[PDB]
Write a protein that binds this ligand. Structure first.
Ligand SMILES: CCCCCCCCCCCCCCCC(=O)OC[C@H](COP(=O)([O-])OCC[N+](C)(C)C)OC(=O)CCCCCCCCCCCCCCC
Ligand SMILES: CCCCCCCCCCCCCCCC(=O)OC[C@H](COP(=O)([O-])OCC[N+](C)(C)C)OC(=O)CCCCCCCCCCCCCCC
Ligand SMILES: CCCCCCCCCCCCCCCC(=O)OC[C@H](COP(=O)([O-])OCC[N+](C)(C)C)OC(=O)CCCCCCCCCCCCCCC
Ligand SMILES: CCCCCCCCCCCCCCCC(=O)OC[C@H](COP(=O)([O-])OCC[N+](C)(C)C)OC(=O)CCCCCCCCCCCCCCC
Ligand SMILES: CC(C)CCC[C@@H](C)[C@H]1CC[C@H]2[C@@H]3CC=C4C[C@@H](OC(=O)CCC(=O)O)CC[C@]4(C)[C@H]3CC[C@]12C
Ligand SMILES: CC(C)CCC[C@@H](C)[C@H]1CC[C@H]2[C@@H]3CC=C4C[C@@H](OC(=O)CCC(=O)O)CC[C@]4(C)[C@H]3CC[C@]12C
Ligand SMILES: CC(C)CCC[C@@H](C)[C@H]1CC[C@H]2[C@@H]3CC=C4C[C@@H](OC(=O)CCC(=O)O)CC[C@]4(C)[C@H]3CC[C@]12C
Ligand SMILES: CC(C)CCC[C@@H](C)[C@H]1CC[C@H]2[C@@H]3CC=C4C[C@@H](OC(=O)CCC(=O)O)CC[C@]4(C)[C@H]3CC[C@]12C
Ligand SMILES: CC[C@H]1NC(=O)N(c2ccc(Oc3cccc4c3C3(CC3)CO4)nc2)C1=O
Ligand SMILES: CC[C@H]1NC(=O)N(c2ccc(Oc3cccc4c3C3(CC3)CO4)nc2)C1=O
Ligand SMILES: CC[C@H]1NC(=O)N(c2ccc(Oc3cccc4c3C3(CC3)CO4)nc2)C1=O
Ligand SMILES: CC[C@H]1NC(=O)N(c2ccc(Oc3cccc4c3C3(CC3)CO4)nc2)C1=O
Ligand SMILES: [K+]
Ligand SMILES: [K+]
Ligand SMILES: [K+]
Ligand SMILES: [K+]
Ligand SMILES: [K+]
Ligand SMILES: [K+]
Ligand SMILES: [Zn+2]
Ligand SMILES: [Zn+2]
Ligand SMILES: [Zn+2]
Ligand SMILES: [Zn+2]
Lengths: 395, 395, 395, 395
């Protein structure tokens, strides 16, 4: 008589058949049919149906059935409630906004985070420490990347570019640094040559950004060597262009840091928080423009309409330079190259400081907390090494 | 015999009729009446009343009945407990302070966040991307707003105001920038004219701050054009005033950013955190005044009562300038235009730095966390698109 | 037979009499006695004892009885668990460290936050807005405090102290500012005189820090007026001392801000977080000393043992000045008056920057979070105005 | 018939014997054996097994049995769930990543935080305040450490090193400071001598870093005294070396601060967050290198290939100095000694500022939150003094 008792894991839940039918197409709606006594596990003597599930969360699922809103309990995790909803046939997109984010947190974080000697030669990058030879190769690669970066940094130092007035007063970098860069080049191009020759999935290897970086890093030395024969003025200009391009040597440390879990988590966080990064950029641009205009106008209060001497006493000659001042003041960087010198400009700068603090504190915590989730999940996955399931599902 | 059993969703709750009557005027108080056996769903054989509700939270409601204090469970959400309290007749303002904020969080966040061709022409701003023509119009508006802002920023640059000594050594802005601003004006005033002519709810349209901004942005060009005919000295002064007013061009980017969810969430957060903003302002003012006075006095320790040379060795000539120093030091901005040069002033500046850090870290986290709630709720509402209810309430 | 059933709010809990006796002196230990059948509410037919309490938390209390450790459920609040423990006779100091802080949070926050016309005249400060006359008096007091502060700030400005060379080239402040300070004095001393004459609890009134501040603020004007008659050189020195003491005028704004809930919450937070403030001070001192010594030594690498020219190229002449540099660099203030100019000093300064960031981020979040608790509780108490209890305890 | 009822603390849990056998080797798997009726507490009349445990968490353990995933309820603490899992034979390493971190938090924090007169003389450092004589000794040690640090700081001040041109224009520190350092030395070496003579566990005492620091602090004075007799030029060089080593006096304040709970918690946090510190270091190095290169190239846009005058207008002569600029800009320190002066360098500096803010805000919150856990746990352990257990385990 409209009375149905559901025994979920030893706990008897009593509700109405109309309440069960309120959500058609689900297991509890099917149970509310006159044929459930034969279509389900039914007890004639006890006059109740049995279910080997978790009653505590069945209570909340039946609360959805009863009221019309699907919430999520805070005493169990999202994955557990998801398994129970899947078993009961409840659509997980019915979760109310008051619980959706907490319910999805873990799944969202997981989504964000996720010849016979030819294989041996291709194993040079895969777990280099696994083999002694590959570990030694990795150590040599670290040496020859650090040395290349050091040579690139030193080539710009004035000590290594004494001015030669014989050939014409121009500068000339020392040749020993070039020789060290050359030995770096020969070793690193040996590695690149073996990687390119012994290369499965050629399309993927070419598309690989790290390999592209390696190729564009090795190109300039060869191009400079070849073009030196031409020894033309246009060849000199192209040599200058090649020197400009030589900066790609610093990008070979991303290969070294590619195995770092913190770096991978940071990359995943950057991919996930694109909206927050765009929000930060837009906020910063708005504040920069507004405060540059405000300081420009506050530093000219009481000035003549067109007198050129109005701008002779203020660092803020124009609004574009106020942009730089505003970004520096908003980031609390405060270089001091430009600062207000009037009372009105002083008030404007104070407002700029507080506004920058607040507008940067708006989305940076969101990005930081996303990074926290992803880092914690990665560390947990490390601390939980793969092992036997220990559980046998039913035949 | 004073013993009453309430069967809430299959779970039997046993309490005393005096306990039920402790809260008069509620459903459980009515149940505690001699006529509940006919006024409610009663089972003579089982001698208990049945309720198709959530027992887990009925336990806490009955705990309110039993002890006298209404708390809120942490295993269910505020909206769920609110529905249950509403059904049971419990006043939601009885929630104790230890649980009120958590119970209300979601509702507070939601409150904070909340001719035949004439409609087609009025659809120019409503979902411009919806129609191809309106999307093109929006692209053109973006172009003509960015170009206007660029021209306004460039007019203040010294490169575009060569000094003319013929007519009288004064500055004169280039005319090509004025011409580009003029084409910007003609397009934007075409848009404004159509918006004003085809305008439902004229009162609302006039009261609209964005439309007011548009009108005050278009006024100065027309006023300068008209007043140039007068060519009087007072007309020149009014032209200078119009140049000052010309700054309202930068306010036309708020129209572009008005569709941004981050901007709307920021606005809602600013509306909600007025108390925290006032607290921040008052704290900053107190600290600024106190530390300006303290540094003024610390830089004059051991000085003569009236010797004018006492202030010749310190940046802190007066307390008003100490205000600027104190705000700069409190925000950790540290421009460096003024800094203590004595030991006592050094100690005072250190105290200013720490005090500013703490007093700014007091309410900024509150504002940030409010922003976090509102942003998370808005993102959840986006991720949860409107769909079928999927639930049928009882006839 | 060692089997006892406890019916707590309709839920039957079955345990052993030895388990109940494991904690002597409590209600459940008494229940485990052969005389509980007459000393408690017992049901012979059902063979169980009845209790009109919350079973969900009785389960955790019985878990304490069973295992030996008292924990606190996260599905209910600390006050609720406290009431239940008090009823069951459990000592609340048995709570394990894994739950003690969460259990106590709310109570700790509450502890931190906590003639016939003679009363009318004494009501001048109590809710001044309550009476129209008192509100007008408060407005006048605000006016005469702001004006006094403005006069005090302006007296130090060079515009108001033109140098008089007739009487002897010394400075002399303008007399109109003194006259305005005098009218401020007469009004404020009228208020102070009425407060002192009509004064209940004279001991408390004298001990009041705000009234002490008022008296020390009014003293210097009278002392300067009286001592001007002496017109002696020692009198001039005492006049200079009185000018130094005149700074106490800025302390009369604490009276205005004493009614501010944010200010009161800040005071409570300062009282509560004394340990964290001491930790911050000690950390800062350690880092300052260490980094001052480190930078002093890093700026003298390769220098002569005693050559005086070693310190001619570095801002770090000594360690005491390195203290100032270190505090400025640790607070991320970066004035720029002193900075490393060597590679070793540069590394030391970088280490100082990161170390300061971390050591300041250590306890500042603790203080901030305490402030957050207290502010949230105060706002909740405001949002929950006093009303009828609505609940009637049993006779 | 495949139906088994488990009565856990008065609550009847009904499941299948196959469900119980899904996890072999556990208590519930043993219960699912035909001999459980004699191997466990069984009730023939009621046909159920009894367990004096917590049903609420038994429900989640049986949910593990049922589904195959072990989660952890959020309504109870990690230690409680750990005791229950241990009783039921469940491996605590089966906890899913969605709950592992919350389940382990407390245990991880605890792991991170963890003659007859000869003993009396050795009690000089153990609870010095316990005995009056030891408290006086501690006060004297504080005096003689602070005075030594003050003398060390003052010896580098130019006031105490007047230049002597008689003996040869070199500097000479005052002798009274040396005499005060000598009395400091005699007292502190008395303490060290008694500590070394009366010393249990000599190996541990020698290995103690604080005692090593004490010995290396006392060595230089004796070495300078002894070597002064030689009075050789090489002896003068070794005297300069000893002056350099004299810096170890500042390390004697770690002994004073070794009893501070905040310092111990900081040390534990540093030990625990090694991964986060390495992440911070690697992030900072990557950003510093990248932004130094970027600013170097942005300040030379449009410059000649080799013209020496290209670097005459920019602070960024090389990339190594850009390293210093980049670290200063990333930490928001902003000294101002070097800043971009071009538009491209300005954009690069802005990007550096935001990138530094974000990359420093990534792991610093993790370290801060670890510190928060450890500090809260230490304060809780203090607030919970050792007392009687009050609970008697079963014979
Ligand atoms: C509590 C009640 C406080 C009451 C005190 C406020 C009233 C006294 C203000 C000082 C009035 C004065 O005479 O000083 C003005 C001086 C002298 O300069 P001037 O007379 O204004 O002439 C113009 C010269 N300029 C400034 C353009 C370069 O110009 C100056 O340069 C003075 C510098 C200080 C001006 C204010 C700037 C402060 C900015 C930070 C404020 C932080 C606010 C936190 C909230
Ligand atoms: C641990 C125990 C530490 C024990 C060391 C403290 C005792 C030694 C202090 C130095 C005493 C000294 O002789 O130096 C004084 C120098 C020389 O100047 P003067 O002799 O004082 O004459 C006055 C000139 N003024 C300063 C007004 C421009 O004046 C100076 O300019 C020195 C600058 C340093 C003065 C202290 C300022 C430091 C401010 C930051 C402190 C951070 C505290 C964190 C907690
Ligand atoms: C990745 C691999 C990176 C490999 C690059 C490191 C190796 C190259 C270092 C540069 C070596 C060099 O020749 O430059 C030295 C210059 C010239 O000066 P000097 O030859 O050393 O003579 C002494 C003059 N001083 C410095 C005392 C004023 O002295 C200078 O002033 C140069 C300034 C830069 C020195 C380093 C300071 C940087 C501090 C910030 C570091 C942040 C680290 C984050 C982690
Ligand atoms: C909203 C729409 C905004 C539209 C405005 C952008 C278009 C106007 C840009 C200004 C164009 C201009 O004519 O100014 C250039 C001036 C003059 O210098 P120059 O003509 O470029 O010659 C080279 C000299 N240098 C710069 C190398 C020393 O060079 C300068 O020094 C000007 C300094 C400003 C340059 C930009 C730097 C700003 C950096 C901070 C940006 C923050 C962004 C937050 C997002
Ligand atoms: C420091 C910088 C970031 C500027 C300061 C930020 C806020 C103080 C302002 C700047 C832009 C403002 C927004 C600009 C325009 C709009 C659209 C406005 O909606 C409309 O105008 C639609 C029509 C109407 O009903 O008026 C709602 C507020 C909002 C989001 C504003 C909220 C407040 C904002 C974020
Ligand atoms: C850096 C700036 C913000 C100043 C430093 C802030 C705090 C160290 C001080 C400044 C003002 C102080 C408040 C000024 C006056 C009062 C009113 C006082 O109450 C009374 O005086 C009422 C009568 C009495 O019982 O004395 C309680 C403390 C409180 C809030 C003080 C708490 C401590 C405060 C916040
Ligand atoms: C930037 C400033 C704050 C200095 C850097 C802080 C930490 C890197 C150091 C400085 C002082 C150190 C503490 C100084 C001395 C001790 C006592 C030491 O215990 C003993 O020496 C007792 C006897 C023994 O077993 O050795 C335990 C570590 C601890 C707290 C140290 C932990 C690491 C600390 C906090
Ligand atoms: C301001 C500094 C810290 C530089 C900016 C940081 C991020 C914008 C960049 C710098 C280094 C990047 C990482 C460098 C290389 C890799 C390895 C890459 O994996 C591979 O290349 C493996 C082969 C392939 O499938 O391509 C995955 C992304 C990741 C972690 C990158 C993610 C994005 C990172 C963190
Ligand atoms: C060339 C004329 C020269 N003489 C003169 O008083 N002014 C002036 C006047 C008011 C004024 O308001 C201010 C003040 C601060 C910020 C600010 C404004 C704006 C222009 C209205 C918008 O942003 N600014 C400048 C001048 O610019
Ligand atoms: C013109 C006389 C001149 N000669 C002289 O010693 N002083 C002096 C003395 C003490 C002194 O205390 C200090 C120090 C630091 C901060 C501070 C104070 C106040 C005045 C009491 C309040 O805020 N300040 C200054 C002077 O101002
Ligand atoms: C007067 C002699 C002069 N010539 C010379 O090389 N030095 C020197 C040598 C090493 C040195 O180590 C450094 C470097 C950086 C920081 C630092 C140290 C300490 C002294 C060991 C402790 O803190 N410092 C200075 C000098 O001070
Ligand atoms: C000596 C030649 C001189 N003349 C000239 O235009 N350039 C130049 C050109 C482009 C350029 O791109 C930039 C700009 C900003 C950052 C940046 C780059 C890199 C080199 C490509 C990598 O990091 N930088 C510099 C010069 O360095
Ligand atoms: K800063
Ligand atoms: K700064
Ligand atoms: K700075
Ligand atoms: K900061
Ligand atoms: K500076
Ligand atoms: K600076
Ligand atoms: Zn919900
Ligand atoms: Zn509560
Ligand atoms: Zn616990
Ligand atoms: Zn889980």
């Amino acid at each position: 008589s409209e009375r149905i008792v559901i025994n979920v894991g030893g706990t008897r839940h009593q509700t109405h058949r109309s309440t069960l039918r309120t959500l058609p197409g689900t297991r509890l709606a099917w149970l509310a049919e006159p044929d459930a006594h034969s279509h389900f596990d039914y007890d004639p003597r006890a006059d109740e149906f049995f279910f080997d599930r978790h009653p505590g969360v069945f209570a909340h699922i039946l609360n959805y059935y009863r009221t019309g809103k699907l919430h999520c309990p805070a005493d169990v995790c999202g994955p557990l409630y998801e398994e129970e909803l899947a078993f009961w046939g409840i659509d997980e997109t019915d979760v109310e906004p008051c619980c959706w984010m907490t319910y999805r947190q873990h799944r969202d974080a997981e989504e964000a985070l996720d010849r016979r000697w030819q294989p041996r030669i291709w194993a040079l990058f895969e777990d280099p420490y696994s083999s002694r030879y590959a570990r030694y190769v990795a150590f040599a690669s670290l040496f020859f990347i650090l040395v290349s970066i050091t040579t690139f940094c030193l080539e710009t130092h004035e000590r290594f570019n004494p001015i030669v007035n014989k050939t014409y007063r121009e500068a000339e970098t020392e040749a020993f640094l070039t020789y060290i860069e050359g030995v770096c080049v020969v070793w690193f191009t040996f590695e690149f040559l073996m990687r390119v020759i012994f290369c499965p999935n050629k399309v993927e290897f070419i598309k690989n950004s790290l390999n592209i970086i390696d190729f564009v890093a090795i190109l300039p030395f060869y191009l400079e060597v070849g073009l030196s024969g031409l020894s033309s003025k246009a060849a000199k200009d192209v040599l200058g262009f090649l020197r400009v391009v030589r900066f790609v040597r610093i990008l070979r440390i991303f290969k070294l840091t590619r195995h770092f879990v913190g770096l991978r988590v940071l990359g995943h966080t950057l991919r996930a928080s694109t909206n927050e990064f765009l929000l930060l950029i837009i906020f910063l641009a708005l504040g920069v423009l507004i405060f540059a205009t405000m300081i420009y106008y506050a530093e000219r209060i009481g000035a003549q309409p067109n007198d050129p001497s109005a701008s002779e006493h203020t660092h803020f000659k124009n609004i574009p330079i106020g942009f730089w001042w505003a970004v520096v003041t908003m980031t609390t960087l405060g270089y001091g190259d430009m600062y207000p010198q009037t009372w009105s400009g002083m008030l404007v700068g104070a407002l700029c400081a507080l506004a920058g603090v607040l507008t940067i504190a708006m989305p940076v915590p969101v990005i930081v907390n996303n990074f926290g989730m992803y880092y914690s999940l990665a560390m947990a996955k490390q601390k939980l090494p793969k092992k036997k399931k220990k559980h046998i599902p039913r035949p």
